[PDB]
Design a protein around this ligand. Structure first.
Ligand SMILES: Nc1ncnc2c1ncn2[C@@H]1O[C@H](COP(=O)(O)OP(=O)(O)O)[C@@H](O)[C@H]1O
Ligand SMILES: Nc1ncnc2c1ncn2[C@@H]1O[C@H](COP(=O)(O)OP(=O)(O)O)[C@@H](O)[C@H]1O
Ligand SMILES: Nc1ncnc2c1ncn2[C@@H]1O[C@H](COP(=O)(O)OP(=O)(O)O)[C@@H](O)[C@H]1O
Ligand SMILES: Nc1ncnc2c1ncn2[C@@H]1O[C@H](COP(=O)(O)OP(=O)(O)O)[C@@H](O)[C@H]1O
Ligand SMILES: Nc1ncnc2c1ncn2[C@@H]1O[C@H](COP(=O)(O)OP(=O)(O)O)[C@@H](O)[C@H]1O
Ligand SMILES: Nc1ncnc2c1ncn2[C@@H]1O[C@H](COP(=O)(O)OP(=O)(O)O)[C@@H](O)[C@H]1O
Ligand SMILES: [Ca+2]
Ligand SMILES: [Ca+2]
Ligand SMILES: [Ca+2]
Ligand SMILES: [Ca+2]
Ligand SMILES: [Ca+2]
Ligand SMILES: [Ca+2]
Ligand SMILES: [Ca+2]
Ligand SMILES: [Ca+2]
Ligand SMILES: [Ca+2]
Ligand SMILES: [Ca+2]
Ligand SMILES: [Ca+2]
Ligand SMILES: [Ca+2]
Lengths: 203, 203, 203, 202, 202, 202
């Protein structure tokens, strides 16, 4: 099934499975940074996002890095249905990214596409930071964006992106090669989704 | 200062604040159970829920156990306006709880009321288990309800409580004095809300 | 439970129960008209609506004529919460009914209140015809309002009442003492709710 | 669209409803008792179209054909005509190996809502055929309460847990039982507001 | 996107709004008085694009061209850019033989919302052309209250009865009356919050 | 008879709009230049009612008075008449010590929407008075684009974050600057579709 570690380690408690998946994927995130692999990823495309997703979740989620084949929703919002996900990703690949407005709009469209069965939030926040670094020489200090504010802004974003754009704009930092900003952002990004067991840099 | 530990322990990292609040409130939950205090609470009333909330969150959330003074929402759903909280809680105190249909309806209305600024989910799930134990001689084995299923069902519940009802009925157990069921349920209930650092029985 | 005939007569097929409830309640509607009792009902108040509802559904619906104690919804519209239902009804009793605009607004508010667990549509349409008869010397020729148009307009009416006002306006007739108009209207009103087995004037 | 309204000069909504119920239920009874139902392609729009035409030929104009107008129920907009064809192309390729996949496929076909009218009844017959082929089960529709079913279908474009739960709990292995089929036709029609006839009495 | 903001260095929103109103209403008056409006393809996106460019080429970047950004009003998300082409080609093939079909076509074109801005005013001109050609009618827009029209358009993706009713009760056979056209331009701009000028005084 | 300036026969919506703008903007200018604005209770429905009456008596029937009908915009239903009074009572007791509390109070007053019309313009004047008293700030409304403001207000019953950001970045310490007040009146009316007059030229 989708959680490849669930049967492998015979785990029947939701919290223990959550902790193990957090540990493995954060190990992978730490390696992605410390190996320098994060600097050799295509920026602003679904190919780069797919690479990030596979890197984080290979041997954790079945078909990591590959588009889902099932329709999904959060709250009352239906993400792009599978039937046109391909064309959605093509359109996102050609969207411009020369200023904060365009980059945030591109991030919002990629969240609407929501191409994977799981792991969209964490992978796409890494992807967004790479776009911001390449184009604005900034990255997000994610700790400066309150979790509940971020989630509300993303819920609002398919209709209007002003909330998420304001939060991102006020969280930007020029410390784009600072390892500490990256690792703290990984921990905050995982906390957004309900993973709080590990610090990435202690793995 | 709603997060009373933030200034007291000078915490500037969201994840660190989340972890300390989890530890303190889970210590309080373990004490609530092991002291037998949980057995001397009024069942199915706002008095009992307020007692549970204060017990869990005193010196963590300002005004623990007391009704909020601000309006709040999650997703697209606006909880009961502050101006009607009093009458909402009065109505809920009068709701019957003789079978699963009525108990689930009462739980759904209490979630709609959402009387506290924070901590509604965890406190109200403890409260619900007490109602089920008293009236049906059952409690919920929360690990049998998947987190995303639970959250979607609660989002659905103000419109129809069928989704939540099924989840609950399929998770009921007669092990109403099983400490392991209670503690595992505390851990799963906190996991529902994004706290995964501690096991309650290890504190 | 709520359908008293299910346990009373041990009917476990939904369609058979539906047919028996249609027969009994249409017998009651026919008696309500032919006895002249309909002419001695208070017009435009919840007292009159409750009298109609009890008359139709006594020994069919538990607590016929009495306000519901649980919250209900249709589609994604939540009708008036129980916690202020009485206040809503007290407001509706004082709403004016001097012309078509005001009568339609009053009908729309009564549908929002939706005071009974079931039977709101049929009872409140009888109630509305009485208001129109008293104040405008008109009643609705319900066959002139298409079922799907009526249902769509009622779904729209809590936001804007133009659709339902238009349909009603176009279907008004001055034959306010014509028995065939009344009986045909009973049949169409039940057809709106999915009852098609009987003609009321054949009972 | 209602071809019988002009033909029999009917001006009462309820009598038109009754005549359409009688004729289409006669067609459903024939579909089962003639054995035609057993040679319908399972799980494709081709099969659904065959069912819809069989039921509603000379009742609905263009029975068996995709609608050309957009439609909605409540505040839910069904698949726009502009990509309906594509929506059907995708549904034909959806897997149907377990209850999860079959329910997801049924939910997508309901979202597509390919016909002007008659989507509910035709697609419930279609769903039973899929369940019969892949799970050796069919739905005992009387075990699914009408209001629960309608609410679950309203919920299903967002989350299909409600409808999945209801279907799962209503499955029976009596996949060639004529009474189960006929009662299911009557309950399926009752869902949509037709209560005049019992199909096996026609 | 607003070319006149940088061109005339305007930093007051109201001042910019007035200048955009004046320039586009001058263009609308010329579109009518030159007879150019009579030589536009009726009922197609090509004609709508011509109207939009004619009104706004000096005001909006890429006037007459489909937008490249996704947009929304209220809680309604208009057709995604990725589908605009297929949506517009579908709209080009929609019939327009009676009021039902014409209103449905207008509703779909509003859902498509092909331009970044100016959809309301341009598409109302386009709609009158269709009504003039096919029904020998145009809309007397002053007979449709602004708030009723806006609510009806908000409702129209779900059900088009409100807007159909308003349009039907506002139709006039004065299809060549210059004052009906000019007053309609003024009312159409008023719908969108431009009230500074009368078009026929420019 | 709600639009007191209206008459019998067909009225032109645009001219009525212009006349109502002129009269109410004259009243707003007088409210400021007479110093009457300085004598208004701050942060209460009493003060809001005074503002609404001052702007709109002889324009709207029952200016300064609570509406008696339920109203909606988009798909949002404002506070029902049935509890409007309790809601205003609650709003009178809400704190206003910082921007978070003041924006929350403004958002609740907009949800209450106590008047039949004129809620936007009157309540924005009211909000500026609260901000002036408690923060020594007012809004430079020209710094908030119309479409951003309207979207943020649509969002505000769910989350006030959008509107709070816009207000926060538009605050100015020029709390007794006549230019800021008059420009803000013009922008506030522009938000609602009135663009004919400049207030200080009346
Ligand atoms: N209601 C919503 N509408 C749109 N986007 C949402 C909604 N809720 C959450 N999101 C986005 O989806 C992300 C979570 O996606 P998910 O697939 O669960 O990723 P992960 O596995 O990393 O948690 C959130 O971080 C947020 O960006
Ligand atoms: N969209 C929603 N609609 C209704 N109820 C919700 C929604 N989202 C979450 N909930 C309920 O609110 C609870 C969380 O409330 P919250 O005040 O955050 O408590 P806690 O501090 O324990 O997390 C969830 O457990 C769920 O039951
Ligand atoms: N989505 C909706 N929103 C508001 N009102 C509705 C909606 N759907 C139906 N209604 C109204 O509710 C009535 C049905 O009420 P119900 O309690 O089912 O009465 P009955 O038992 O007579 O069918 C319909 O006739 C219609 O007037
Ligand atoms: N709001 C909704 N959202 C999604 N699906 C719905 C909604 N309302 C009804 N449905 C589905 O549509 C079906 C009815 O479609 P319809 O075309 O009217 O068929 P029929 O002519 O057989 O009644 C229902 O059985 C239900 O499955
Ligand atoms: N919530 C909504 N849903 C659907 N359509 C809408 C909505 N709000 C406005 N519209 C339509 O959009 C038009 C406005 O489009 P816009 O691109 O702003 O045109 P303009 O620049 O001419 O004002 C309105 O006239 C109305 O027809
Ligand atoms: N959909 C909506 N939801 C919440 N608030 C809204 C919505 N639409 C408009 N508003 C608020 O209502 C105001 C308009 O109120 P209205 O009574 O028309 O006042 P006015 O007569 O001054 O224009 C807007 O300025 C905005 O603040
Ligand atoms: Ca997540
Ligand atoms: Ca740890
Ligand atoms: Ca929570
Ligand atoms: Ca730990
Ligand atoms: Ca009904
Ligand atoms: Ca019969
Ligand atoms: Ca139907
Ligand atoms: Ca019969
Ligand atoms: Ca506009
Ligand atoms: Ca002028
Ligand atoms: Ca307005
Ligand atoms: Ca002027």
């Amino acid at each position: 099934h989708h959680h490849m570690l669930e049967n492998k380690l015979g785990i029947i408690n939701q919290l223990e499975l959550n902790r193990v998946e957090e540990r493995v994927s954060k190990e992978n995130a730490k390696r992605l940074y410390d190996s320098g692999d994060i600097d050799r990823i295509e920026v602003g495309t679904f190919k780069g996002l797919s690479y990030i997703h596979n890197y984080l979740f290979e041997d954790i989620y079945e078909f990591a890095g590959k588009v889902r084949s099932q329709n999904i929703s959060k709250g009352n919002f239906r993400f792009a249905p599978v039937m046109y996900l391909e064309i959605a990703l093509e359109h996102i690949d050609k969207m411009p990214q020369r200023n904060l407005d365009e980059i945030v709009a591109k991030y919002v469209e990629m969240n609407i596409a929501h191409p994977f069965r799981e792991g969209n939030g964490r992978a796409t926040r890494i992807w967004l930071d790479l776009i911001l670094k390449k184009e604005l020489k900034r990255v997000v200090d994610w700790n400066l964006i309150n979790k509940e504010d971020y989630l509300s802004a993303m819920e609002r974003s398919p209709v209007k992106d002003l909330e998420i754009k304001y939060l991102i704009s006020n969280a930007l930092t020029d410390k784009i090669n600072d390892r500490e900003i990256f690792m703290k952002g990984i921990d905050i990004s995982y906390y957004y989704e309900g993973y709080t067991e590990y610090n990435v840099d202690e793995l």
